[PDB]
Curated annotation (Swiss-Prot), chain B:
Shown segment, full-protein numbering: 306 to 356 of 725
Record text on subunit structure and interactions: Homododecamer. Interacts with the terminase large subunit; this interaction allows the packaging of viral DNA. Interacts (via C-terminus) with the head-to-tail adapter protein gp4; this interaction participates in the head completion. Interacts with the scaffolding protein; this interaction initiates procapsid assembly, thereby ensuring incorporation of only one portal ring per capsid. Interacts with the capsid protein.
Protein family according to the UniProt entry: Belongs to the p22likevirus portal protein family.
Job of this protein: Forms the portal vertex of the capsid. This portal plays critical roles in head assembly, genome packaging, neck/tail attachment, and genome ejection. Procapsid assembly may initiate with a nucleation complex composed of portal and scaffolding proteins. The portal protein multimerizes as a single ring-shaped homododecamer arranged around a central channel. Switches upon genome packaging from an asymmetrical conformation in the procapsid (PC-portal) to a symmetrical ring in the mature capsid (MV-portal). This change of conformation may serve as a signal for headful packaging.
Localization terms from the record: Virion
Protein name (database record): Portal protein
Length: 585, 51
């Protein structure tokens, strides 16, 4: 019926699989264990080979330039009044390094095993509910070969669409784990799947009961500005729009509606899982967003199914033939086991006493006795053995050897310019950009001290009812400018749950890109290319302030800030913050 | 790239080289492949006078 839907959308997976289900194992079949099916009447000693790894390991050393510590952003709309506590914008993991290390085997690996992943905090865990930014991290999903594949059009980065609603990872007897945090269920959803064991079950694990989770179906929401034919019976109700100039003002012909996002009832029916049944009811997740970004790779392709192998397919050909070198001998080593010369020896068969090792020469009774017509030998000499001193393998294996080293190739050069950064590390900065919906988009945690003028304080706006006259500062007193004062203040509206299309805030997070932007940047890149390009002058050394001065240590960062420049300002400051500074008598 | 005798367009690449450079190396497998994987009784063959 029409219940099926996404099944076909998912079944094309098994239709796109064909042999990639079998041939995506092959990626590590060359890096792991045996020579598999091809050989007919295969030989002994089985499975230790290796020799592959360094290419897909040591070049990951080229991926470690990453750290890129960044803070303290310029722009207009963003007010750096709260910049003191704003530090949560830059790094959510700032209280642990384990998040930086956790890239581990997952993220670096697009070939040897499955790709990496990333998870932000599932909203509002009760841990540490105090102030702005609290995040830590978890493992990126296990490889699980190809049978975990993420496909709709296999194009977009980070959704903005409802697809790969499938979220699955394998488990064990205890692997059910934390899902019991509310209902406890039966612990068993019990879907039944079919995996390629090749039907005879030759091996150990008979386990069953494959379980998963989903979100919703196609999850399409359009704001959908609204006008329709009034009197004609109007079935199907309202459509949705692209270009507005036609429809601007109907006020003469049109009605007065004032309707904004009214649906509040069902649209698409898949429920959740299966061909033959479905069960669950009343499942919704918090507020609905998608700041969870599984990482993707990039290569342009030819046809149909989504496949891009690793960078190195070259391991097979040259490396077969070394095992061939040891094979042609290791088979015949028992067939040339250091054996006997002949025929003037009369030893033939003899007494058993003689296998004690024979360190005395005379041995046993040699004779020339034979029977024939006359004396002449027929070749009892030349044949013993002969080597062929293997020949053709010389430059065939020099070309195999010089070949299989092509896997190591990235940007062969000397030094300095024409960077050796990896094509896989240049799609890592779009993983810095992975999340589309961050923005300032939703602000609930972390935003400020108060919300909507602390939802009390705007009462000052009503205090305009006061008679007589409003005046400016007098009766100074000793307190004066100390912080946290409210008497004469002008503020209107409010701020909560961000705003509708209104600036005054902006995303402080990532400009990541080329090396342009400098706060103090290349000063900790020191002399690696030349050295300081700005000599000095008599007034001009007072402008070197921006060059050197950096960070941290203790509170000994004082450095002329609080004394010299106050009564008169000779050299200025970089972006004076100074809520209030100078007092005058 | 664009230009041609007719109006047909096959883009002009730098990778068009394949040809006989590689293929004879691919033909060499006719030499070895049948005399290695097969078992053509290569031995120190002597003294089967009869049977």
């Amino acid at each position: 019926e029409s219940i099926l839907s996404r099944f076909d959308a998912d079944w094309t997976a098994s239709d796109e699989a064909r042999r990639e289900a079998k041939n995506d194992l092959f990626f590590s079949r060359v890096s792991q264990w045996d020579d598999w099916l091809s050989q007919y009447t295969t030989l002994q000693y089985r499975g230790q080979f290796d020799v592959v790894r360094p290419v897909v390991r040591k070049l990951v050393s080229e991926m470690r330039q990453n750290p890129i510590d960044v803070l303290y952003r310029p722009k207009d709309g963003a007010r750096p009044d709260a910049a003191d506590v704003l530090m949560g914008m830059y790094r959510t993991d700032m209280r642990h390094n384990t998040a930086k290390i956790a890239v581990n085997i997952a993220v670096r690996e697009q070939i040897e095993a499955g790709v990496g992943a990333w998870r932000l905090v599932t909203d509002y865990e009760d841990q540490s509910p105090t102030s702005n930014n609290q995040v830590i991290r978890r493992e990126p999903i296990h490889s699980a070969c190809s049978h975990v594949i993420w496909d709709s059009n296999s194009k977009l980065m980070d959704k903005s669409d409802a697809r790969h609603c499938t979220v699955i990872h394998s488990m064990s007897q205890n692997g059910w784990e934390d899902f019991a945090e509310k209902y406890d269920l039966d612990a068993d959803d019990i879907p039944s799947f079919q995996n390629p064991n090749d039907w005879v079950f030759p091996w150990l694990t008979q386990d069953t009961i494959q379980i998963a989770e989903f979100y919703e179906v196609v999850e399409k929401k359009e704001t959908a500005f609204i006008y329709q034919d009034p009197v004609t019976g109007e079935p199907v109700s309202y459509f949705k729009r692209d270009i507005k100039d036609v429809i601007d003002d109907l006020a003469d012909s049109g009605f007065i509606k004032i309707a904004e996002r009214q649906i509040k009832r069902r649209r698409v029916y898949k429920s959740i899982i299966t061909c033959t049944a479905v069960l669950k009811d009343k499942q919704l997740i918090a507020g609905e967003h998608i700041p969870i970004v599984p990482v993707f790779g990039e290569w342009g392709f030819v046809e149909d199914k989504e496949v891009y192998e690793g960078v190195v397919r070259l391991t097979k050909d040259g490396q077969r033939l070394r095992n061939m070198i040891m094979s042609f001998n290791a088979d015949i080593v028992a067939r040339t086991p250091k054996k006997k010369p002949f025929f003037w020896p009369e030893q033939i068969a003899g007494f058993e006493h003689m296998y004690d090792g024979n360190d005395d020469y005379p041995y046993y009774l040699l004779n020339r006795t034979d029977e024939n017509s006359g004396d002449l030998p027929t070749q009892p000499l030349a044949y013993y053995e002969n080597p062929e001193v293997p020949q053709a393998n010389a430059y065939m294996l020099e070309a195999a050897t010089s070949a299989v080293k092509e896997v190591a190739t990235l940007g062969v050069d000397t030094e300095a310019v024409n960077g050796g950064q990896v094509a896989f590390d240049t799609v890592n900065q779009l993983n810095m950009r992975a999340d589309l919906e961050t923005y300032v988009f939703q602000d609930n945690l972390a935003t400020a001290m108060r919300r909507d003028g602390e939802i009390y304080q705007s009462i000052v706006n009503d205090i305009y009812d006061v008679p007589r006259n409003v005046t400016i500062t007098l009766e100074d007193g000793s307190e004066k400018d100390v912080q946290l004062m409210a008497e004469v203040v002008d503020l209107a509206t409010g701020e909560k749950q961000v705003l509708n299309d209104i600036r005054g805030r902006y995303e402080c997070y990532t400009d990541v890109g080329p090396s342009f932007q400098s706060m103090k940047q290349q000063n900790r890149a020191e002399i690696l290319e030349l050295l300081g390009k700005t000599p000095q002058g008599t007034p001009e050394y007072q402008l070197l302030l921006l060059q050197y001065f950096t960070l941290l240590d203790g509170k000994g960062v004082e450095m002329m800030r609080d004394y010299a420049n106050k009564q008169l300002i000779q050299m200025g400051v970089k972006k004076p913050e100074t809520p209030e500074e100078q007092q005058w008598l």
